Write a structure and sequence with these properties.
This protein has 321 residues and is α+β, with helices and mostly antiparallel strands. It has two domains: 125 residues, 2-Layer Sandwich (Phosphorylase Kinase, domain 1), CATH 3.30.200.20; 191 residues, Transferase(Phosphotransferase), domain 1, CATH 1.10.510.10. It has nine helices and eight strands. It has a six-stranded antiparallel β-sheet, with helices on one face. A two-stranded antiparallel ribbon has the order 6-7. Strand 4 and strand 5 form a beta hairpin. It is globular and about 60 Å long. It starts with 10 loop residues before the first strand and ends with a strand. Bound molecules: ligand 5FI and zinc ion. Zinc ion (ZN) binds next to loops. The site of zinc ion (ZN) has 5 residues, from loops. Keywords: Acetylation, Apoptosis, ATP-binding, Cell cycle, Cytoplasm, Kinase, Membrane, Mitochondrion, Mitochondrion outer membrane, Nucleotide-binding, Nucleus, Phosphoprotein, Serine/threonine-protein kinase, Synapse, Synaptosome, Transferase, Translation regulation.
Length: 321
Amino acid sequence: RGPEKIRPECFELLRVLGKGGYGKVFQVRKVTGANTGKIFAMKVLKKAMIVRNAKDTAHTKAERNILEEVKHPFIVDLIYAFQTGGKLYLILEYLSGGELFMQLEREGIFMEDTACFYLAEISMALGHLHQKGIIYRDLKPENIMLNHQGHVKLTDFGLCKESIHHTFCGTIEYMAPEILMRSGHNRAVDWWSLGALMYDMLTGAPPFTGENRKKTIDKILKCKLNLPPYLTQEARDLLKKLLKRNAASRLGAGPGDAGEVQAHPFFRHINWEELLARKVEPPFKPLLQSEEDVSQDSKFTRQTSESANQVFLGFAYVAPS
Ligand SMILES: CCc1cncnc1N1CCN(Cc2nc3cc(C(F)(F)F)ccc3[nH]2)CC1
Ligand SMILES: [Zn+2]
C-alpha cells in the first residue's frame, strides 16, 4: 500500500468526447482503488509536439498550474494529472451537462431571465480568474460546459482543441478587436467575450460576421452594433457597454472588474450568495439515467533530443479531498 500510483491502466476508455490536435479527450471509468467505477474526462496530450513550440508548452503548463491553484464552482475540476513517457494526462470531472449553447439550437433563442442566470455564473468564474491574474482570452460558446446539475463550468484552459492551426485558429467571431489586430490584451478582452457570448445567447448568432475571414475581421473592427428590437432596455445597455472597440471604455475594464459588470441593472434579480452556492435551480437541469451518460458524432476507442525533458517535471497531481 501507500498512495495510489495512478497510471493510464487505472482507467478504461468508454468513448471519445473530443479530439485535436495535440491530443484527445475521452470519457473514462476508473477501474482501480476506492474510486473504482467513477466516470471522468481524460485529456491526453501528445507531448512530443508540444515541446516543439514554446507558446504551446506555455499553455499546457499554465493549465496544469491553474487547475491546481484555481478551484471555483463554475470552473472544471482537475482530479488527477500524470505523465507517461511521450504523453500528458489530465483527469477531470465528467461534465455530463454537455455544452450550454447546444441548448440554443433547441431553444432557438434564450430568454433574458435564462441568459442572465448563465451569464452571472460565467461572470463569477471570470471574476475569480482575474483575481488570480488569469485572463482567458478567447472565450467561445463551446467553452461553456455544464455539470450534472446544469450549472456552468469553464473549460479549455489548455492549448487548442483544433486540428488545423492561437487566435484565428478555428473561429474568431467572439474575440475582442485588440486581440485580432494583436496590439496588447488585458482583463477587458474577457468582458468583450462576455458581451459576444450574451449577444449569441439572445440572437442565436455572434454580433459581427462575414462571408469570408477578411470581412469578418473588418466587421468586428468596425464594431457596428446591431441590436434586435425584442431586447429589454437593460440588456441593450449592457451589450453596448460590453462591446466597445476601445477596451478602456468597456465595462469591467477598470479595477472594478467583475463586481462592476455584476452591478449592471441587467443582473438586478441575482442573489449572488445563492448563485455561487448553487442553491439556485438552473433553467436547464439535464436528466441523467446513469453517471456515464452521453448527450453531446463521437465513437471508436484508442490509446489510454530524447533526454532534454525537464519541462513537465512535477506534472503529477492528485486533488485535495
Ligand atoms: C475535459 C473536460 C470535459 C469533461 N467532461 C466532458 N467533456 C469535457 N470536454 C471539455 C473540452 N472539450 C473541448 C475539447 N478540448 C480539447 C483539447 C484537446 C487537446 F488535446 F488539448 F488538443 C483535444 C480535444 C479537445 N476537445 C470537449 C470535452
Ligand atoms: Zn490552433
